[PDB]
Amino acid sequence: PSRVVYLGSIPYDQTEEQILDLCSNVGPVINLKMMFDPQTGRSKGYAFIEFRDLESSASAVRNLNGYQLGSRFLKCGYSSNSDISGVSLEHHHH
């Protein structure tokens, strides 16, 4: 486990604020990394979310995985990273 989770299969128009609001139902979020196209504002379909504690990140993996958001079923797993700084490395191997 990690306090950081990966969240994937996110509908592209969902904003950082909407993903933050979603994740808040799990627990407090201390960091959130997403990517958006500078011309369209559309995201790339994923986020890394760092929670305040491991109970919360466990709950994220259990309860955000399979969560229906719009027409999509989200995927959620633990990040291989213990902190938010290295997550870009991880994602560019997928």
Swiss-Prot record:
- What does the record's miscellaneous section state? Present with 6350 molecules/cell in log phase SD medium.
Q: What does the UniProt function comment say about this protein?
A: RNA-binding component of the cleavage factor IA (CFIA) complex, which is involved in the endonucleolytic cleavage during polyadenylation-dependent pre-mRNA 3'-end formation and cooperates with the cleavage factor NAB4/CFIB and the cleavage and polyadenylation factor (CPF) complex. Binds to A-rich RNA sequence elements.
Its quaternary structure? Component of the CFIA complex, which is composed of RNA14, RNA15, PCF11 and CLP1. Interacts directly with RNA14. Interacts with polyadenylate-binding protein PAB1.
Q: Which organism is it from?
A: Saccharomyces cerevisiae (strain ATCC 204508 / S288c) (Baker's yeast)
Protein name in UniProt = mRNA 3'-end-processing protein RNA15
Which residue intervals define the domain RRM in the entry? Answer: 3-81
Location of the protein in the cell = Nucleus
